[PDB]
A paper describes a structure:
The spike (S) protein on the surface of the virus particle is the key protein for the virus to invade cells. The neutralizing antibody is an important protective barrier against viral infection.
Among them, the E-RBD antibodies XGv289 and XGv282 have the most potent ability to neutralize the current mainstream Omicron BA.5 strain, as these two antibodies were initially developed for Omicron BA.1 strain. The neutralization ability of XGv282 to BA.2 and BA.4/BA.5 is more potent than that of BA.1 and BA. The L452R mutation exists in the BA. S protein, considered to evade HLA-A24-restricted cellular immunity, which disrupts the hydrophobic interaction between XGv282 and the BA. The critical mutation S446G of the BA. Moreover, K440 forms a salt bridge with D104 on HCDR3. The rotation of the F106 side chain extends the hydrophobic interaction interface, all of which further stabilize the interaction between XGv282 and the BA. In addition, mutations of S446G and L452R in BA.5 remodeled the interactions between XGv282 and RBD, increasing the interaction surface and affinity.
Author numbering:
A (entry chain N), B (entry chain L), C (entry chain M): 1 to 111
D (entry chain A): 346 to 491
E (entry chain B): 346 to 394
F (entry chain B): 492 to 589
G (entry chain H), H (entry chain I): 3 to 119
I (entry chain C): 153 to 178, 186 to 246
The structure:
Amino acid sequence: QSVLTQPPSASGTPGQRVTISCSGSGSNIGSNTINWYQQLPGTAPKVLIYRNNERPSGVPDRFSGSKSGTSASLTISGLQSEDEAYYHCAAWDDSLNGPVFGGGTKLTVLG
Amino acid sequence: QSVLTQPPSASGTPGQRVTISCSGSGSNIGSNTINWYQQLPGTAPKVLIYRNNERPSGVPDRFSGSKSGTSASLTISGLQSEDEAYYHCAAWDDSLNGPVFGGGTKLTVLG
Amino acid sequence: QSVLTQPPSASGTPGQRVTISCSGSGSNIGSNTINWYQQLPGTAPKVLIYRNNERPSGVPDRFSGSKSGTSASLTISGLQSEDEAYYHCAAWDDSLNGPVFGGGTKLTVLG
Amino acid sequence: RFASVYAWNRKRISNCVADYSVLYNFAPFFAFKCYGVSPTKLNDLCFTNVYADSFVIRGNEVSQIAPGQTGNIADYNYKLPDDFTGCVIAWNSNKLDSKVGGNYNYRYRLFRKSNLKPFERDISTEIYQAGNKPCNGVAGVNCYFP
Amino acid sequence: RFASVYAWNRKRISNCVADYSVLYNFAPFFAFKCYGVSPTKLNDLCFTN
Amino acid sequence: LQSYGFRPTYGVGHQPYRVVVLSFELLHAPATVCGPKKSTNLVKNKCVNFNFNGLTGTGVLTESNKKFLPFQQFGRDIADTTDAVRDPQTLEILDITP
Amino acid sequence: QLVQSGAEVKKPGSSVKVSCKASGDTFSSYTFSWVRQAPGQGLEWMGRSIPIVGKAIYAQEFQGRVTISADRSTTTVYMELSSLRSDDTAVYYCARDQSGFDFFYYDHWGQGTLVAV
Amino acid sequence: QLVQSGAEVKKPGSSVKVSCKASGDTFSSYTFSWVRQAPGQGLEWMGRSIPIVGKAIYAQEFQGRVTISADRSTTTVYMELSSLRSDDTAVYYCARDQSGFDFFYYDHWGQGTLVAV
Amino acid sequence: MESEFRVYSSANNCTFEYVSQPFLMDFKNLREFVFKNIDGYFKIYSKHTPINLGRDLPQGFSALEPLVDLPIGINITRFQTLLALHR
Ligand SMILES: *[C@@H]1O[C@H](CO)[C@@H](O[C@@H]2O[C@H](CO)[C@@H](O)[C@H](O)[C@H]2NC(C)=O)[C@H](O)[C@H]1NC(C)=O
Ligand SMILES: *[C@@H]1O[C@H](CO)[C@@H](O)[C@H](O)[C@H]1NC(C)=O
Ligand SMILES: *[C@@H]1O[C@H](CO)[C@@H](O)[C@H](O)[C@H]1NC(C)=O
Ligand SMILES: *[C@@H]1O[C@H](CO)[C@@H](O)[C@H](O)[C@H]1NC(C)=O
């Protein structure tokens, strides 16, 4: 509902690459970076990728971000059976002078 | 039809809070203020609220503006039986270097 | 039939001065110039006079235009035996934002 | 409200005790230049007459307010003489003065016949006429508004 | 004919005596703004290029 | 590239204004562009304030009897002070007495 | 306090004078905007005027076909419109620009003239 | 100097290309108008074309059913007409707009194509 | 016929031109020149004197009087002389 609109739901077959994208106003999403976080339910969420390309240490390799213009897209190649989660955009924004987040798609891995 | 798009119509029950919102390009509506005016038909219109929060003197209290980001919203708590009117956005804009207005919703109070 | 009404026909004796006039709405014929062209049948027409007074080079002298107010008149002193033709008004017009022409009198030189 | 630079506000200061503690508690002070004195040694001297002049100028103009300069604001709007023993204070004034839509209430002089003598104000709104033909009060050629 | 503003006409001026009397005898002059100089004191300086 | 208007039925703010921008710089060239100089009735036998193509001084101008070499503009006396000049306009040699 | 000129029907291609007159306070301090309203629809912006130096400033949609000036001798603002059509049969409002800070807000706001063609 | 394309009969409801080609001087400086003449009657105005920016401009009577463009690569102007009937069986003239000042005057003026249906 | 195309082959962007009449030739006659370039000003001094037969630099004295004074603004460090070859 905030300044960076997230599509709400996505699901499908396991073991397959999928993508999820985030696109908002050019005040921040075409002017600054788009980091991505992951929310595991019942606990505190994590971080996934900063500066749209580089993971941090410890986290796996199969996730990959892209700032394809105004379309920020996570690609998940080789989907596994533990990350049924809520994936959340993030961006610094110079208009509100702050980080601004998004609703996060409730991505569900089937059995 | 101008740079700040106004939804055209709204109506409903009297004696109730309602809201009306204005949202345009981030050149002005996310960079500068959003004042609000009211047009009474058959005569010259008025002013309602400047700087999104503060009324001027004389005008009542029940109207309230909000610059909720790109959504500028008037809330009308306790709707009365005299302000069947046209409500008009306004904003300074640095692109055209001037004030720019909007069509104004033709808000109608039923009987 | 267009915005500058031309009288349709005129004839008479050769070797004599004659006149032909064009008069329309004050949107163009009393606000802008009246050029004049000549149409020879079976071929492409010519130009006769621009800015109501000055001929171009090559064309003869005996034709003369006048913007006598709303009456634009060509005077033909010493009529000769080759210009049996269609004479056409012309004017720039700011209303339709374009040149606008007229039907042209089918002026016929007798034997 | 500060008056514009063509008709600058002047005030003579009568006898008092002059605590300069205040006047330090104002702003980050983009320019604080004393000339005949020094600000660290300001609370011991005792001047006879004190003239406070005040106006608003543009941002890249603060360097022109100085003894012995030449520019479009020091020619015939405010000429500071070389016998200057005062102190020029100049700070950024945003939000109080710079209204949106511009603020056309301030103005400054552009053309003049003669350069101004030091410490001289003029509210001469005469239509400047430095041409051959007479204009006598119309905004045309060889006769602009100053 | 003057060229349009995207490809603007440029000319270097060689050495001469530069009477600015002319250039004053043209028009009612909607804008005449010198910046580094003043038009009343234009006939005494001597610019190189 | 998008074109302009300039229709005779336009108001001010739409009409074509011709613009000439002069740019000046003054660094190193000795012979360059100035405005004419203008002179005045060269009086004689009077104490006047004179300037002969750069030479600024005061004194009385009188007919001389010195002969300069076509390339010389002015002369100086012993003790290195100007004592004669050549009028740039009329090309005549004049003594300067105090 | 502002007061307006008359409202009257003209002919196409003509030139039309409208004048707004101020009363109630000082006049030169304020500025004056001029807006236009098609009937039944929303506003837009037509021409700003500064009575201090006589400068006028306009919009790139409708620059040129309107001129606008004022005099402080009797505090009257004259707007002259040219090239009228069936698309300018509109109500025209002079307005007091509330200078404020950070907002524009369109002050005492006056009353304007209908123009029909 | 202008030269024209062929003159030929078409069928109703079709789409028709006509082309005018320039030779004799520069080409981009000038503009090009396009007028239409019913046989035995008087002219009117159909479509203006500016070969500088490729912009076209038309008349409110016959906007849309004709397109008009040009190329300065070989100085050829293409007018395409659609929705022909028995009311467009007419002679069509490209023309050199003499820019002049204060007058239009329709310059060297070329030669155009008959169109029958 | 007197051509110039055997000296150079490009003449792009000159900012100085000058035309004076004599510059040369006002028993044998000695012609002496002095060129010096100082502060962007080229100074040519010249003197043409008739001499008798000797060492072509005769024992005597003759002062050189100035000829031109050009505002060029050019670094000058190399030079050579032109000739004519009559084909
Ligand atoms: C500069 O121009 C003036 C023009 O007035 C020249 O003065 C004239 O010179 C001629 C030639 O000897 C005389 O016959 C005239 O009588 C002079 N005019 C006057 C008013 O006395 C002057 O000679 C020129 N100087 C140079 C160096 O060319
Ligand atoms: C007083 O005189 C000076 C110079 O004569 C002038 O600059 C100044 O404007 C005058 N002041 C008034 C109030 O007339
Ligand atoms: C003269 O023109 C040439 C163009 O070939 C350019 O390279 C050069 O810089 C110009 N000279 C000067 C002094 O600007
Ligand atoms: C001329 O020489 C000086 C010093 O030798 C140097 O600073 C300058 O750049 C030179 N100019 C050119 C055009 O080479």
